[PDB]
Design a protein around this ligand. Structure first.
Ligand SMILES: C[C@@H]1O[C@@H](O[C@@H]2[C@@H](O[C@H]3O[C@H](CO)[C@H](O)[C@H](O)[C@H]3O)[C@@H](O)[C@@H](CO)O[C@@H]2O)[C@@H](O)[C@H](O)[C@@H]1O
Ligand SMILES: C[C@@H]1O[C@@H](O[C@@H]2[C@@H](O[C@H]3O[C@H](CO)[C@H](O)[C@H](O)[C@H]3O)[C@@H](O)[C@@H](CO)O[C@@H]2O)[C@@H](O)[C@H](O)[C@@H]1O
Lengths: 307, 306
C-alpha cells in the first residue's frame, strides 16, 4: 500500500489552483451562508481530478482558439480549442473545458494572436465577463471585449492570458467578483453539469481552511479575495502519487522546521479539502518556512485541537 | 532515497523560463553559442541554481513600487521580493529569483492597488531586458507604459508577463535572443553567481531542450523558448533531494500504451539532458509518453541513437 504524503512546500512557494498566482496565506472562516463549490483545485487525496481541474498552473483561466469579430463592436467570439490546440469536445463528462474560470466576474487580460504564414503577431487588452449570457465555454464559445474592431484575424491561433479582475467603480465597492458563485457554463437559461460537489465542514467547531490569494485588480474596486481548497502543487502531487486513502480523513500537522513544533493540526478529507477547529474569520499567522506533514489516517470521530 | 523523475507528460508540464506550457521536445547543435539560462536550473539532488525558484507563475514577474519619469510614459520599479519583503541586493544570486534570463522586449501588464481604499488600475507595459537601465540585481527596472499619470507612488505594483515583441521594420525574428543573458546590474557591469553554461561532452551528443512558443504581442518576434528542465522537474528534485549515485542518470522515454522505448537520454546531475543525435530535430512523440529513470551510469555510457 503506497504511503500517503503531502508536499513539503511552504504556502508562499505554492500556487492558487483557481487563478495563476501564488498563495499568500491561510485563512479560515464560516461558510454556512454560501455554497463552496469551486471546480478548479478539486482533487481526491488519491489523485483523481474533479470538476474542471487540470494539472497546469499556468493554464488556469486561460483560453485558446480562433476568434470571429462581432460586427459593429470591439467584441470577439472565441471558438474554443483544447489546451494543446486539438478540437474541443462538448460531450465530454465535465462541466466545461478544464481550467475554465469557476467564478462570476470580469477577468481582464490580454488576447494575443500569431498569423501562421508570416509569424506576424498582435496583442490587445481584453475582458471576459463570466456572468455574461454569451459566456458558454461548455458549448465551446466565449465572448471577449477588446480595444480593437479590426486587428484580429480569423482562422488564426489566439490566446487569452489572464491578469486580474475589475469592478464598476460607480456601483457598490467589492461587490464583484463573486468567488463562490459559479458561472452558468452553457450560457443563459441552462443548468451546469458534472460538477464537483459542494463542500462543508460537518464536525462541531470546524470550518474550512482556505489557501488564499489576492487577485490583481485592473480597474475600479474589485473584491480580490480568492480562496482555493487545495494548492495546485497538492493537485499535482496527489495525481502523481496516487496513494490509496486508508480512511476518509488524513490528519496533517503544520510544522515549523526551525523548532520542530506543531503550530496546528488539520483534517485533509479524502474528497479533497481541509478543515480546522476554529470559529470565525481568521488570517493564520504562520512562520514563513512552515509546511504541512501527513501524520496518520484517522476515523470519523477524531477531534482536532483548537487552532 | 531512490532517485526518480515525475511521470507527467511533456504537454502536462511547464516551461521553467516563461510561464507557459511545454509544447515539444527539440534537439540541435549548440557548439557555436553559449547555453547559460538562469531559470530552470536545478541539480538532480535538489540544489537550486541561478535565478531559479519554485513557483511557475512567478517566472518573469516583477513586484515593487513605481516612480514616474517626468516627460515620459516610463516608470522605474523599485523591486521587492515576491512576498513583498525588502529585496536584498547582497544575496548571493545573479538577480531576484524569476528575473528574465534573456535579452528581449517582454510585454505584459502593470497592475496596482491603492492600499487605503482598494482602488485598482492596469496598464500595458513593456520591459526591455537589454536596456542600460535594466538593473534587477540592483533592485531597479524600467517599464514603458501607456500612461503618464495613472500610477501612484508608494503603492504595491505588479508586472504580469504575457509575451514578447519585435520591431517589424527590422529583420524578422532577430529578437528576443533567448541565449543572451541580460547584464543584471545594468550597463557596464558583470554578472555574478551564474549557473554554469552547459554543453554535451560525449561524442555525437546534443542537448535535449524542452521547448515552448512564447506568445507574440507585436511585430515578428522569435518566439522559440528552450529550457533545460521542466519546471515540474525542478519542483520534484528540490523536494526529493534524492542523492546522486553518479554524474549521469539514464532515462528512458516510454509509451505506456505499448511499452516501447522511443529513445533514451542522459539526465546529468548538474541538471540538463543530452541525446545521441546530430542536427536539428523536432522529436515526434506520443502525448501519453513520459520519462522513467532506469539507472545511474558512468562517464562512458554510449546512448542508443535517437
Ligand atoms: C478606481 C479607478 O479605476 C480606474 O479608473 C477607471 C477609469 O479608467 C479610465 O480612466 C482612468 C483614469 O481615471 C485611466 O486613464 C484608465 O486608463 C482609463 O481606462 C474608467 O474605466 C472609469 C469608468 O467607470 O472607471 C474608473 O474611473 C483606474 O484607472 C484608476 O487608477 C482608479 O483606480
Ligand atoms: C506586424 C503587426 O504588428 C502589430 O502592429 C504594429 C503596430 O501596432 C499598432 O498598429 C496596429 C495596426 O497595424 C494596431 O492598431 C495596434 O493596436 C497598434 O498598437 C505598430 O506598433 C507598428 C509600429 O512600427 O508595428 C506594427 O505595425 C499588430 O497590431 C499587427 O496585427 C501586425 O501583426
Amino acid at each position: 500500500s503506497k504511503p500517503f504524503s503531502v508536499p513539503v512546500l511552504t504556502v508562499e512557494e505554492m500556487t492558487n489552483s483557481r487563478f495563476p498566482i501564488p498563495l499568500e496565506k491561510l485563512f479560515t472562516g464560516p461558510s454556512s451562508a454560501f455554497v463552496v463549490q469551486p471546480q478548479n483545485g478539486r482533487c481526491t487525496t488519491d489523485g483523481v481530478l474533479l470538476g474542471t481541474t487540470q494539472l497546469s498552473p499556468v493554464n488556469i483561466c486561460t483560453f485558446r482558439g480562433d476568434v470571429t469579430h462581432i460586427t459593429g463592436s470591439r467584441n470577439y467570439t472565441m471558438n474554443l480549442a483544447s489546451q494543446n490546440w486539438n478540437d474541443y469536445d462538448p460531450t465530454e463528462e465535465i462541466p466545461a473545458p478544464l481550467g475554465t474560470p469557476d467564478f462570476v466576474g470580469k477577468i481582464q487580460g490580454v488576447l494575443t494572436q500569431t498569423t501562421r504564414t508570416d509569424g506576424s503577431t498582435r496583442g490587445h487588452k481584453a475582458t471576459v465577463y463570466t456572468g455574461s449570457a454569451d459566456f458558454a465555454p461548455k458549448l465551446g464559445r466565449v465572448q471577449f471585449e477588446t480595444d480593437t474592431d479590426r486587428d484580429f484575424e480569423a482562422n488564426q491561433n489566439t490566446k487569452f492570458t489572464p491578469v486580474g479582475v475589475i469592478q464598476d467603480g460607480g456601483t457598490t465597492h467589492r461587490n464583484e467578483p463573486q468567488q463562490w458563485v459559479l458561472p452558468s457554463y452553457s450560457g443563459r437559461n441552462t443548468h451546469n453539469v458534472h460538477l464537483a460537489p459542494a463542500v462543508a465542514p460537518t464536525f462541531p467547531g470546524e470550518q474550512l481552511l482556505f489557501f488564499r490569494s489576492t487577485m490583481p485588480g485592473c480597474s475600479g474596486y474589485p473584491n480580490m479575495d480568492l480562496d482555493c481548497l487545495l494548492p495546485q502543487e497538492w493537485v499535482q502531487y496527489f495525481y502523481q502519487e496516487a496513494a490509496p486513502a486508508q480512511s476518509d480523513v488524513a490528519l496533517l500537522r503544520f510544522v515549523n522546521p526551525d523548532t520542530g513544533r506543531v503550530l496546528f493540526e488539520c483534517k485533509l478529507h479524502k474528497s479533497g479539502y481541509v478543515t480546522v477547529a476554529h470559529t470565525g474569520q481568521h488570517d493564520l499567522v504562520i512562520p514563513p518556512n512552515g509546511y504541512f506533514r501527513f501524520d496518520s489516517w484517522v476515523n470519523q470521530f477524531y477531534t482536532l485541537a483548537p487552532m
